[PDB]
Amino acid sequence: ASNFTQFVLVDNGGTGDVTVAPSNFANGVAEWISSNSRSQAYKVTCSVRQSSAQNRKYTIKVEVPKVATQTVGGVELPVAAWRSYLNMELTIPIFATNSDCELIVKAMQGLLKDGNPIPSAIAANSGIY
Amino acid sequence: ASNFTQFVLVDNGGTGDVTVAPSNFANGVAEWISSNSRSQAYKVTCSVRQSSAQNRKYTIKVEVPKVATQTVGGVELPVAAWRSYLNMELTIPIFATNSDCELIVKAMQGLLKDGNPIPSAIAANSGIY
Amino acid sequence: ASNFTQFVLVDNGGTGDVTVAPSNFANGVAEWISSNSRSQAYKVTCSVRQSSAQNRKYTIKVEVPKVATQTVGGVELPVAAWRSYLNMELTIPIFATNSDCELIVKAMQGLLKDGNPIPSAIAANSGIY
Amino acid sequence: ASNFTQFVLVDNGGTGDVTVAPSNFANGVAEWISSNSRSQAYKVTCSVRQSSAQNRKYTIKVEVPKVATQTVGGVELPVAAWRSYLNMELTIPIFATNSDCELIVKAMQGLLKDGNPIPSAIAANSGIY
Amino acid sequence: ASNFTQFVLVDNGGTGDVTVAPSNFANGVAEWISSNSRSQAYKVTCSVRQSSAQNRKYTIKVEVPKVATQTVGGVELPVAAWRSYLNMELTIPIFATNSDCELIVKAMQGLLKDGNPIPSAIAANSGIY
Amino acid sequence: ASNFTQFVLVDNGGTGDVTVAPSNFANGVAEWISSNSRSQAYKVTCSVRQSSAQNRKYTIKVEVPKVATQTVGGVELPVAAWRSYLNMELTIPIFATNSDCELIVKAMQGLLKDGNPIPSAIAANSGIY
């Protein structure tokens, strides 16, 4: 069941979608990037290992470019002002079955579903109030 | 209106859905828990802070329990056999607009969407290859 | 093309086969793991290195679990009652051609072919008699 | 009945097979040797012992020669230019049944089956890629 | 689709072409080798890393052997009389777009094109004058 | 056989080609540049020497400007953000003949030929996957 394929990272209704495609598999770490320069591209990485005696840990990183007032192909500095970073670590005990892992995935999807407090706060440049 | 509202963490189609409701805002950490004992409850937390002069960081955590009944000293108690922990750290520059933040949210949603490589690998107890 | 793919480790006809899938490639050690619970999963690893100026060395390991349920204090977990461990080391001089390597592989396959003394002894809980 | 018999180590169709024959059983180590010159012969050994109170351990070794003629000072001798060495150790708990042992054997056979990653890598003078 | 595929390193017009095929990806270094013994094989390696915060560096290496047969202790072995080593280091800023990288590739191709000064000098065992 | 002449570094089908012409021969090091400012020009350098007792080494350097969003004739800073560097060293044993050197040149051309993994990865801002 090979799964290292391109996918739509940002869905805009079919027109203007952001697709990321495989770009590196060194050290077993899967990497996707969009069709941009490295400084302006969307980037996704994922790897999994045995973190402890009874846990496995998925390490997932996503980089998102700032698009407002962007100059496509230009040199934008400082780097920290134009990019957002997501560092996500999912720790799963070795006892969890496929059904348990499906439940965990559903939990993450519900956490980030549109209209829910966490995505609403992030999208509104706000905290919890 | 306040964004600190209850939401469906795990959507099973209307029956058996896991709902978490606001439970604490002490020390600046927003907390949600399911309607269970603290030993067996689902948990969601979220906080935001000025990580540096020009960046803001969201810290989001979710706990998924595997419930069980444990006999301790001849008495049965509701416990969790194990818990799966999700830890998310999201750093956003202060220069990001609302549209940029919406792009970040859509990126995360597309990352965790059903059928995509990372959720498929997590549900299948496997890495990316 | 790529040989870091999933393959059938145990061929139980057409139904009930044990398939292992790539999970990790850290430190140049390829690792395959079967699906469902990690505590009960099969494991295969392989790595190759230049052991001396004139020799290359393969290190191959396989773990076969006996699946069982553990119940301690009323809490049930999926575990391996015990595991069987295979450790293989194969040394091949740099002078060996592809034909020589194919001959070595055929030698190993004939070593483990059904009806031969060593697989018969292993399958019968017996030694050489 | 007896498993200390001659068997085909390398199956080159029907003509040119490499057969090894019993030669020695000293110190509980069974040894097979192919015919013609000992300096150029194939070698297979196998022994089993109680490694711990709960484990039995098989030690299996195979030597594959590269046949050549050595000429020193005008005197010609049949020698092995070099040898490939396989060392296998398999540990099986005393609790394993005959069915469990057959499963272990099938696991090894599937490990070395043609088209699988590890035999392909060995036969192609290659690692995992 | 994966870009880790075999390719013709030396094009002789269809007969006698030197082909290298993927052979290893351990430790993040992609390796290609020709269908020969390791002692006499052609070799290509390639790796990429974040050399600094704003630059990426490709490290590309090629080995061209001059094959021979050496008598060692009265036994003839396949060796390389000598090897020619090519070492390429290519540093690219993260701000470079795909078109910029295509310009880099075209520059290298034009640099090594038949009839040009540098390849003519290399083929003629001479410098530039 | 004088060979220090201008050549097409980047071929764009005859229109828009990038030509580099001789610009310096100090210290015996041949240098080519395009018709630009030194900060924005293509630059090629080449020299050869006896590197060791049994090896000669060609040292070849190429500088490529970032063209996307370029301001022709402008002051672009930092320098490291607008230029890519190739450092290529070819080591050839003193025993190699003209035919061997032609083979080495063919190897380099095949390495960098369009459609092959290394140029594809470089042009796609990607590694090996």
Author numbering:
A (entry chain B), B (entry chain A), C (entry chain C), D (entry chain C), E (entry chain A), F (entry chain B): 1 to 129
Provide text from the study.
Briefly, we purified MS2 capsids from *E. coli*, performed disassembly in an acidic solvent with the removal of packaged viral RNA by centrifugation, and reassembled the capsid proteins at neutral pH in the presence of ApoF. The @ symbol is used to designate the packaged species. From 5,000 micrographs, we selected ∼240,000 particles and used icosahedral symmetry to produce a map of MS2nc at a resolution of 1.86 Å. The nanocrate thereby provides a built-in resolution standard, determining the principal resolution limit of the dataset.
To prevent this, we describe a method to encapsulate target proteins within highly hydrophilic, structurally homogeneous, and stable protein shells, which we refer to as “nanocrates” for this purpose. Our approach was inspired by the established use of natural virus capsids and engineered protein containers for packaging applications.
